[PDB]
Every structure is written in structure tokens, then in C-alpha cells.
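Table S5 (text form). Sequence records supplied for joint modeling of the four-component complex.
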Amino acid sequence: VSVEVSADGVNMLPLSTPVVTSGLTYIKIQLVKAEVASAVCLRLHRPRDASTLGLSQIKLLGLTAFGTTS
Amino acid sequence: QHSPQVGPTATQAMQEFLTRLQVHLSSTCPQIFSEFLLKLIHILSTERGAFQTGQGPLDAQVKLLEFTLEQNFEVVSVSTISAVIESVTFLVHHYITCSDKVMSRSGSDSSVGARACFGGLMTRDQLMFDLLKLVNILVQLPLSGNREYSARSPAYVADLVLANQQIMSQILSALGLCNSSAMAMIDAISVGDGLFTILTTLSKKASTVHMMLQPILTYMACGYMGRQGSLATCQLSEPLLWFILRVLDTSDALKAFHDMGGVQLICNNMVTSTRAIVNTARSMVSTIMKFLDSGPEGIHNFAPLGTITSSSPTAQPAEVLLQATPPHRRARSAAWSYIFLPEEAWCDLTIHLPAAVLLKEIHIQPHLASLATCPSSVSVEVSADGVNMLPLSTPVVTSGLTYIKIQLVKAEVASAVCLRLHRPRDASTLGLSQIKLLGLTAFGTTSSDQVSKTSIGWLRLLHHCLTHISDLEGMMASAAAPTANLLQTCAALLMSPYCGMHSPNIEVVLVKIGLQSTRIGLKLIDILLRNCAASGSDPTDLNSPLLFGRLNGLSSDSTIDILYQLGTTQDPGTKDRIQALLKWVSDSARVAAMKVEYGLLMPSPSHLHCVAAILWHSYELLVEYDLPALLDQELFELLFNWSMSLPCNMVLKKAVDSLL
Amino acid sequence: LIIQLSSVPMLNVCFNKLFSMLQVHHVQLESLLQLWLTLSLNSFLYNANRIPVISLNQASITSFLTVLAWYPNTLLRTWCLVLHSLTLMTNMQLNSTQESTAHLLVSDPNLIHVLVKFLSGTSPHGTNQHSPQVGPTATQAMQEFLTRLQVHLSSTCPQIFSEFLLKLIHILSTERGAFQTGQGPLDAQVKLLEFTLEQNFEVVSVSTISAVIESVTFLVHHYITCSDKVMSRSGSDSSVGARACFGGLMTRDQLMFDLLKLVNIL
Amino acid sequence: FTLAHERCISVVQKLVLFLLSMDFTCHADLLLFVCKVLARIANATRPTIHLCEIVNEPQLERLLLLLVGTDFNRGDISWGGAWAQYSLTCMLQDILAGEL
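The corresponding C-alpha cell record, covering 1096 residues in total, follows.
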């Protein structure tokens, strides 16, 4: 998986090198330095053996400037 | 854990940067950009570089080479080109030479290996193939007047490359290690194809046949890595032989090859190499072992006959993993399970076989119902005697694989196998379904390139030299006959199981050489009839040829054809040949009155019938010598006595009576 | 009732010739080592306490190390055979006042090159995928080799062995070394460091110590400074990060921690 | 069942001399049995035969070069195949073990 983050919403910059996620039952990427983001791009690589991708859910966690969410 | 790649965005950014640089510099001075790019490639590919150690992002490097392949090099220097060629040649030779003995890939993968040629009748090997394509483009550049810059009699960089001994030696050695399968039954996809294309271009731009021919002769004149000595001969393969045959396709090339003394070189090489090889085909012993009905893709599963065990005292018994019939694909429980302690990293399973087996493949099938329990990596160890176990290679990564298959490039004699399984990435239990070991046996019902393995390539080269162009043929014959033990070696190669070339070509070679003189004809008659062993061969030397191991006077259709060709060809010396044949017949008849040499003690009936046919068809035609004068009455008396003394109704009597 | 001689003298002569033929490429190293081991251990495992039946010369060992130093590429099986061969050669005697075989091996500059090549390089990198590790067997072989070396040199001159270990660590940890770029097998390196941690450094030099300290400090500072912005683990991993202290109220950071423990001892 | 030492030395010497003189006109399957018979005969005699009695110095060197030499073995290609290599190694090991 390769993760890219865009703050304005048009120009996206990769965050790091791809993360190896073979044989994992749950994928969780944490940022050491929280980043102001308005769009997120996920690039998924072809599986080693099969030829189809299957997914269940995606969650993005963060905080706001004001409001009930800190 | 991160991949050794960079992602689709950075690669495209780098490509855009290079494209902008090229576009801006094109109208002003593209030679500077080309020099910069070549220097970058040279630094990357040099010793202790990124390419040699496999360090950086592979996709970016492949994109760099792809971009480089469409550039223009019309003014670049000549030292840079030579340095790049040397570095790339050394790197590719190193890559081809040292490759792993273990191959493993997904079921989806279908790309052929590196050492496979003539397949058409991401990955690191693609990087090597692109580097060879770059070399092929570079080697065609015309040179300027002072031969210091590439130009915008036309010289070429190929002439500079041909004069470098190390480069040519490395290229030829690398090509000699490849192999082909389609050509066995008689454009570029792999790296061997790239080497073939480079050599073909070098031949096409040589500007003089001597320049191309000299490195080939130097390579054929030395052994392994340039070593000298007796019984040392150069490695030869199928694509290399194909290239050499393509080089000698013209009359001028063959004449120059003869002038340089290559025709003696190949004959000497054949004679020496036959001495240092044992035939690996089957013989009487295998047949007799088959007759005893038993003994100590065609491969068989030996796992069900072995015993499985583990070093963990608290492990579930695993004898079910050896069953031949696989479990159901939709089973809800794994056939075998293992629980890992928090401080444990590896588990081991050992399979013992009742007898030694030539192992080729290992199959492991995980529990498909839940792939989170697939082992993270596997390490394989093999023992031949059964106690000392030696690892085979580095562990193989097997995460997210539905089927594990390990193939050995070199089949190994094994009697015990150890499998070390690594802890899964996420789960904490191991689940397995089946294990299979595939191989072959020395004997029994389960016991089921030729140029590289035998000494037949030199014979094919000699046949090509003799029969390609009929005008020069006689010349070649005159250079081949004086070599020692050549006829004996050719005859020995004639009466063996098919090892890479058909009998008619060997017959043609033997007939063509045996007719260029008269002494050679008598020597060939003696070889075929009364003695076929080496000349001046004492077993006390350990280096002279020793062609034992074959009975004298064995008759086959090829031998009959050769004898008929020799007997009934109208030329000077035919009278001597007929004299020798009749002398052999007389000696065989005389030795029958024994109430010592083999062959004389057993005249083959078909040979006698061939002699009778020769006499009949020679008398029917007209000859320049007196045939009736040769047939004395004493021979008639001997033949009649031999026929009378022999029991009725057998083939020998019929042959003698046909002669009568 | 006749008297019959022994075959070991002529076997010794033949094997010395064979080892002398290596440099000019007349024999193959892997086959030679395998045959050597099989015939020598006929007195049935690779136990590190067995004296070889066949014995070699000083020149044979020198030629062996010289060939190993420049050898183009070695597979894992070749390295295992090499390590077992060296372990047996340590027990061998050069008598038939010379030094011991261990003393000859240690004071040779080529041993450093051989060990660095083993610990900083992988198998040939083809189109297949292999782990950057070496397995449980090669690591054990290397540990046994080092243990035999230490045991033989302890009573004579342990300072030479300690100097050898410190120089090897310094070369590994220097700029453009294996540790700096994370190249070789991690488990073998961790085993080497955890073996080094129990040594005695009584009479070693002082330039070697200073060089080792400088190299390790620079490497650890570089490692702490430049760390990735993205962190990702399995659901089972629980170890804390590098920049976390007072947690008390395999992995590369374990290699760094062991290097720091070495500096603390020094 | 007892084998006398004096009579078998000539047979073993001729067998090993036969081993050293095989070329392309001989086949490996015969070699696999020759090696086994030689080892069994050597171990059968009560004062078992030693390797120094069987071979000569150049003969022993050639025998070892058959297994490790680079003019007979070419990378992945062996002398007479893996079975021949295995048989030669087993024969040498059995003779040496018999002596000691």
C-alpha cells in the first residue's frame, strides 16, 4: 500500500515508501507527525497469487480545529 | 518492513525531469546530455555499484534505462563508450555465472529463465536485458576521422571492441553457459538472446573476417577460464554452436578459418574431449536390472513411503501430511497444526526415506480455508547420508501464497529432508495440508543440452566444414587426415546411442575423410573390420586415448553402407581396397581351420554379404583394373571347405554360399 | 602376517597438492571442501571437537584464505562448508617452535576480509524473492567457529582475539559499512554482537577503542536522527519505539541497543 | 565364508585400474556396480586391504581429480552424473573406514 496526502486537495505527495502488507489481517498506518489533509490517495498493489482485490472497510482518524471533536 | 521500490509517483516525476532536460538541451548541445547520461550509467554499473549489489528502487532504474534507450549518441566521446561497455559486460557475465540453485515462483508467473534461448523461435533480469540492448545500440556507432569521437572507409566501435580480449572472452564465456530447448528439436525475450544479438551485430560490423575469427580461435584454444593443460577443452553449448556455424557461412570465412589452422584445432579437441567423458546413457546393466523385475512429468512422489518427525516434544503427530490423496479444498480444519511459544521463531519437520533418491522438487500446500496461518518463510536442508544436513539456500518468502513449490536447478542425491518453517506474520499457529517430494530412482520402474554434456559439437563443426561448400571440400580433408586417432574416435561415436546428431551425417564425414587418400582407406578398413581400438595406447599414461569397451567387427546398416561406398567407388587405390577386403575374407576363412583376433574369429554374415554384393556389382559394371585376376582358385577352395565344414541352415552358411 | 603401512601420508600429500592447485583454477572449491570434510570426519556429525584425520600445511591454509578473499560470489551452502572447514582446521596441528593454527588464522589480514564479506553480503540477487536472513544453521556454525577460536587462544594471547573482534566491528560499523546501509543478514550480526558482549578487553590498544567508539556514536546518532514519518506494525508487535525512555517504570533497533551496550562496557 | 588377503590384491588392483580407463565407450551403470564390488571385496578380507596398497600416487591424484577436478567437472555438469559421484565418494569412504 502507498499513501499520499493532499492539503489543498489537488496536489498529492507520497508519504513514504510502500508498506508490505502480505498475510496481514488488519492494516493500520500511523503518522509520527500529524498532517493537515483534505484528500487522501491509496495505491494498492496487485496480490502475489490471486488476480482480484477484495476489501471490507476504510477508516480515517484525526481531529478538527474546533467543535466537539477537539 | 518496506518494499525496495518507490511507487508510481516518484518514478513519473523523475521521468518528467529527464524529459524536460533533454527537450531544453536538444537544440543547443545534445552531446553534453548524452555524455552525462552515459557517465551516470557507468557509475551505477561499476564495481560496488547499485546494479551489482541490487540496492536501489528497481522500477526507477528500469524507467531510467527505458528512457535512455531512445537517445542519440552522434558526438559523444570514445573513452566513455568503452568504459560503459566494459562495465556492462562484466556485470552481465557475473549475473549469468553465479545464479541460485533454487527456483521458486508464484503459480501466476510464467516468464522463462535467464539461461533460456530461442523462446520465440518489475524484475532484475529485465534490467539486464535492457543493459544488453543499450550495448547493442552502442556497438554500431561509426567513428570520426581521428577515431576520438563518434561520427555524426567507415570504421565502427565494433572494431575497437573486437580488439579487446577481456570483453570478447567474457561475452563468449557467458554465451557458452546458456541452453536451448526449442533448437533441440530443430525475437529476443531473455538475456541469452541479447548476447546472441550482440555477437551477431559484432560479426556483421567486423570489416574483416580475421578480426571476428581471432577471438573465436583463442577461445577454442584454451580450457576453463583460460587454463591450459591436457584433457582441458572449452565449454560448448547449443546457441554458441549456432553462432559459430553462422559465422562460417561463407567461402571466405571458411578459407580464412582453414588458413589459421582451426581445422586441426577442432579435430584435436574432439579427440581429447572424447577421452575425458563417460557415456551416461543406459546399457546392458540397466536392461538386466529391469529383467530382474526390481532393484535398488515422469517424476514420482516418494513422500508416502517415508517417516515424518519433529524436534518439538509437544507436537501433534504429522503422519497425515504424507498421504497421497489431498484433503478437500473446502475443509474447515487444517490437517496439521502447530502452536508457537512466545519466544519461538522456527519449527522443524524432518522426513526420512528408506533409500537414496534423486530429488528435484518439494511441494507444500497450506490450509486454504484460512491463509493467515501460512508460514512466513521456508528453509530447506538436504542430507545424502542421512545424518549431516546442509542448507540449500536462503529462506524463501511465502506470504500470501496458496501453493509452495521449490525446484532444484541441479537435482540432488538425498536421503533425508529438513523443512524449517517461520512464524506467521500475524497469527500464532501454523496450519498445513500436504507435503510431496518428487524425484527419480537409479533403477526400477520409477527410473524414467547434449552438446554441453558430450563431445559431439566438434563433430558437427567438422561436418559443416566438410559439407557446407563442395568446392573447398578436398582442401579440408587434406588438413584433417594426418591427425592421430581421428578415425577411431569417429567410428566410436558412430556405434553409440543417438547423442545429438544422426547417423547419416557421421557416415558422410567418415566416407569423405576416408577417400582423400589410399593409406587412410586401408586404415579405415582395418578400423571397421579387424581392430577399432586406439593406436599406441598404453593404460600407463592416463592421458592417451583408450577406446576399449567395444567388440570388434560389429555390423550395422551404417557400417554396411560405409563398406559399400568404399568398395564400389571408381578412383585410384580401389584395387588396394578390394585386396584388403579379400585378404580379410581369406584370413577369416583360414582361422576357421582351428582344429586369434576377435572379428577374424567372428566374420559378421552381413559383412560377407556386403563383400559378395560389392564383387557382383563391380563385375557387372566396367572397371579400370582386372577384377577376375584377383579372385584366385585357392580362395574358392577355402570357401568351399568352410561351407562344407559348417552346419546346415544358419545365416553364416548362407552368407558363405552367397560369396561362393 | 605381513606388515602394512598407513594411507594418511600419501593422502596428506595429495590433499596438499589439491589445495595448492586452487589459485590457478584447476579444482573447484566447494567439491574440494565437501570431500575434505567427508574424508576427515571418518574417525559422525560436524562436531567441533574432532581432530581431522587428514592434516594440511601452513601454505595450504594461506592459499585457502587468499582464494576465499577474492572469490567472485558464494552461495549459502558454500559458506556453511567454509565455516565448518575453518572450525575443523582450528583443531588441526601444524607440527605434522611454530605457532598454533588458531594463531596463524587470527594474525592473517585475509580473515577480516572473509568475515566482512560473509556478514555484509547476500546470496546472488536473481529474479526471485528471498529473506535478508540466513537461517538457524549458518548462525550456529559461525557461533561455533568463534567459540573455538576464543577457546584455543585464551591461554596463549586473548588480546589478539579481542583486537580482531574490535577491528571487525569497526570495519562493519564505519561509513558505507553493512550496519550503515542495512545490508547483510540481521540475525548473524545480532549473534556476533551478543557474543562479543562477553569478551575481555584487558590489554587491547587504545586507538582501536577510540575508533570503535567514534564510529558507533556517529552511527547511532544518525539512526536516531533520520527515522521514517510513517509507522506500521502487525497486531502482535508490542515493542516500544526507539525514542522512548524509562519504559521500565530479530529487529534492527536491537542491533543498535547492543552496540550501545558495547560502548558502555568499553 | 572367508577370503584370503593374498589372492584379492590383484583383483582389486585390476578393478581400480579398470576404473581409471573409462571413456565415452563405457557407461556409468557399470561403474556403479564396479565401485560397490570393489568396496565390498576390500572390506571382506580379514586383514582388510588399505588404500595405499591399491593405488599409486599419480593414480590417487587422478582418482581425486575425477571428483574435484575442473577438467572433468564443468560447473553444474558432473563426471558421470550424481550417481557416479555418490558411488565414488561412498567407495573411498568405505575403504578409509575399513582401514581405521
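Note: The interface with chain A takes residues 1-3, 5-10, 106-108, 371-372, 374, 376, 399-403, 424-427 of chain B (CB under 8 Å).
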